Paper text:
[name], another GTPase, activates the ELMO-DOCK-Rac pathway during engulfment and migration. The DOCK-A (DOCK1/2/5) and DOCK-B (DOCK3/4) subfamilies specifically activate Rac and have an Src homology domain at their N-terminus; the Src homology domain is involved in autoinhibition and binding to engulfment and cell motility (ELMO) scaffold proteins. ELMO is structurally divided into two domains: an N-terminal domain (NTD), consisting of the Ras-binding (RBD), ELMO inhibitory (EID), and ELMO domains, and a C-terminal domain (CTD), consisting of the Pleckstrin homology (PH) domain and proline-rich region.
We performed 3D variability analysis using the 3.8 Å-resolution consensus map of [name]/[name]/[name]/[name]. Next, to capture representative conformations of the [name]/ELMO1CTD/[name] core region, we divided the [name]/[name]/[name]/[name] consensus map into 10 classes by 3D classification. Five classes of sufficient quality were obtained with resolutions ranging from 4.2 to 4.5 Å and subjected to atomic model building and refinement. The resulting structures of classes 1 to 5 differed from one another in dimeric molecular dimensions. The distance between the two DHR-1 of [name] at the tip of the [name]/ELMO1CTD/[name] protomers, measured between the Cα atoms of Lys460 (one of the phosphatidylinositol (3,4,5)-trisphosphate binding residues), was shortest for class 1 and longest for class 5. Structural differences were due to the conformational changes between the armadillo repeat domain and DHR-2 in [name], accompanied by a shift in the PH domain of [name]. Consistent with this theory, our cryo-EM single particle analysis reveals that the [name]/ELMO1CTD/[name] core region is highly flexible and can, therefore, readily transition to a flatter conformation.
Residue numbers in the entry:
A (entry chain D): 530 to 727
B (entry chain E): 819 to 1368
C (entry chain E): 1 to 269
Amino acid sequence: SRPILELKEKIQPEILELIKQQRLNRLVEGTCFRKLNARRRQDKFWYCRLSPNHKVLHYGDLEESPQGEVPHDSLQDKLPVADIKAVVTGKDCPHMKEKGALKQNKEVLELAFSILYDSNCQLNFIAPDKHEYCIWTDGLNALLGKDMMSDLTRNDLDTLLSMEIKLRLLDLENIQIPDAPPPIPKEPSNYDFVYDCN
Amino acid sequence: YLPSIINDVKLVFDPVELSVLFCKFIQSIPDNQLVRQKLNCMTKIVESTLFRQSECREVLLPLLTDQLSGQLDDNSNKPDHEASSQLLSNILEVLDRKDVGATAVHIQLIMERLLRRINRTVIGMNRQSPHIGSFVACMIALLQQMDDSHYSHYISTFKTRQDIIDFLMETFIMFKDLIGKNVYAKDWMVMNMTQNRVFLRAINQFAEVLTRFFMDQASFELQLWNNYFHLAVAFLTHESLQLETFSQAKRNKIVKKYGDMRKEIGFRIRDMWYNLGPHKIKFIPSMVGPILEVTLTPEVELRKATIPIFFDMMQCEFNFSGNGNFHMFENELITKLDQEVEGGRGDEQYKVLLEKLLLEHCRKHKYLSSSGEVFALLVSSLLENLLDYRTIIMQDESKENRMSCTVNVLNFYKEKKREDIYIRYLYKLRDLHRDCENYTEAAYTLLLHAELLQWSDKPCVPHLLQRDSYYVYTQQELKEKLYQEIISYFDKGKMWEKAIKLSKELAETYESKVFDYEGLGNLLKKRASFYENIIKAMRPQPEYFAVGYY
Amino acid sequence: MARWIPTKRQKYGVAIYNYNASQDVELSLQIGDTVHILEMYEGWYRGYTLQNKSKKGIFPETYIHLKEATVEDLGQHETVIPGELPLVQELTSTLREWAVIWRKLYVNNKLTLFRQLQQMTYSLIEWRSQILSGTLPKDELAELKKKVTAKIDHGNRMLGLDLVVRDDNGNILDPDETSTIALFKAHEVASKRIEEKIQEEKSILQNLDLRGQSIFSTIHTYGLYVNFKNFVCNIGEDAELFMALYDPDQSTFISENYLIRWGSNGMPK
């Protein structure tokens, strides 16, 4: 399966772009995200909707909405995607290093993601669980045009690439791929096709 | 139980004597005893021993015909629909059997003994919730089992022409009511295709009978072409490229198994329209519309064949252009074309080939073809306008863009002065602004509509008579009703000044012309509310910005 | 390059791996690129590819796994068994379709039915692989055909896909416009399968006794399997175990006594 494996991993890009468009679709549909220490009458649920243009984010302190995203002008309908330095994950989020009233506890170590913008403004947000945290980070990194950091993303990569090549080798049933590629027979220098082209 | 013996009894007995004995026995049944049971009986009978037919079929069936024709209409067929359907299914199947025996002439006997019968049945058997689908299957199996020569032998050669005319009209309204409100799950695509092929065959046959008994041969009674083209075009209004596209092989599957039925359908319709000859002009303005969509077909070749029909019909009018010209034709053309294209139907290649074809057809021809050239240049302008409209509609999906483009086409029409479709888009934009609650803008639109109206009594054109409600609507009444609604909008538009302005003139029209003072009372009541609002409360001043697009 | 000759014994133009891009009309040709070649060269073959049936590509003979077979597998007797190969090609096509709708799927939150499709796909591909060999008995052929047709038409069903008829032998005999009424009753039988499966999705996907009664209404004879492990009793002498089925309500036995000899050591004799 060495030619098989090299062929499978060598035609990578389609699944990669496929997955990342799926990611950005998920970002656009989004959901109500989570704030910091939204306890004393603070709406911990609030939607962060990416534009279908995928350039502006529709977000802010919306109500405790179980339904999730609601289509309207959010509190802030812009996140400048052209100047997001990065999103810090984990202890790199300064809001975790807060030791006063905004002390995030040790059960949100994997839900910390602060969008860097304005070179001083951040968006320290929380995720309901790890899977969509990684999902959103993947989608943003796609907006960054970079690698994906969801374990589920690698899962999809592997399963779909394996399926795809699996459904390719039906033509080679009862045939073997020579590890050394077959020699290219000499092509006569003349291209005077005796038969008509097309 | 008695059918159980017939097999080996035949094996050791005379075929035809058995046949006639069973026939006489069944005829010995009193006419109101155990109908379903006997139906099952001769079901099993036609099951076996019908492999050898030439000695029994011709004698067994006459009985079956008699009882099924009794089942035709006795006002008590309610119990026997499903059973008689089963009988028909089985008999038609065994007739479709090839090795069983020669039946072509016997197929005819079935024709003349069962065809009009089942037609009248489905006429009565006209509800879709029941097992009607079985009957439809039976009758289509009939129709495919036939032959064109068959179709001709007697069904085409009935008694007086009136009877056959009524029969043909009934068949055609049936076929239209069948293809419309289709009876299948939309999943039995094989059924849909086969039904299309068989309906194609049948409508072909009824087309040649129309030619050979109802052309100038029948110099009069030549209406039914309205129905026939209606049915044909309706049949040409599904099973199109995109359904064909779902799988790539879907195109391939259908074209291999059936080809593009639409192609020969359109060709048949085309040659038929050509065949109409002198009756074309007597028949043009109604059927102008019914041909655009077949011209709009997403294919290429029959379109190439079909645009010339437009020049053919304007030519027909040119022969009639001694009194006027194709103004009637072009008006319907414009209207239809507008609503179909705005329905998201056409494409630019269509417009290019249209221009090419119409211009080429007009070049060979005279002055009136030059007038057609300029009008079709107008047409091409309209086409590109609508195409731009729809591409922006599908492209931005924003209120701003759609209102912008619809206003653009509105102004275009105002230039073109086709006021009716102009009103139509007026109402479209009204719907949009209402969706945005832009009461000011919506009411202004209704104002623009009311502008063309007068306070006269006579409703001058039914063009201003819209689809919202339609009866006499004296010009005065429509104007005042519009004004009323506009006033409502201004009121919830918080612009009471214009409300007052129109309230005054509504009042004066009441006073001088209708003398209905109750309307006065209510109108000015609201007028007082308006003055109260305007002096009493305060409302914010909207800001204005300059947007420079570059 | 010259001397190309039209032929129709190449319908299975088989790639070997992702081809080199040597030709202006060839690329990293995908594994299952069954290409409809039109023209023959000894070392090369150019014609329509499955990816683009309107384009040519000159492909090495050492790269083509030549197959003289055409769309019909009986004229050249390419059938592993007659009347079955149509099924494998059709199911491969449906797998292509399944993958397409699969792309259509994950982008949407249909993951439950998505995974159900996944497991049906696994079952179908393994059934395909095993029946690629004709080693199965005729009863196995019939049973596989029935169940695979059921599964595949069900897959068409919940995906809103059109259906096929002619349960056995390639599902193609009926759609060959042989009849018209037999076609209608075939469509009715298939839709009956459809209604069966739509009512039994909530019957088996949720409950487990309805399938038991349905299967048990198809067979009349049954066998209870008893696998003894060890006898835990304090006797100290030889023991005879008369194992059988009994009816407490009827106060009688239902099966003959099965005699087990048990030794005095705690072990069977």
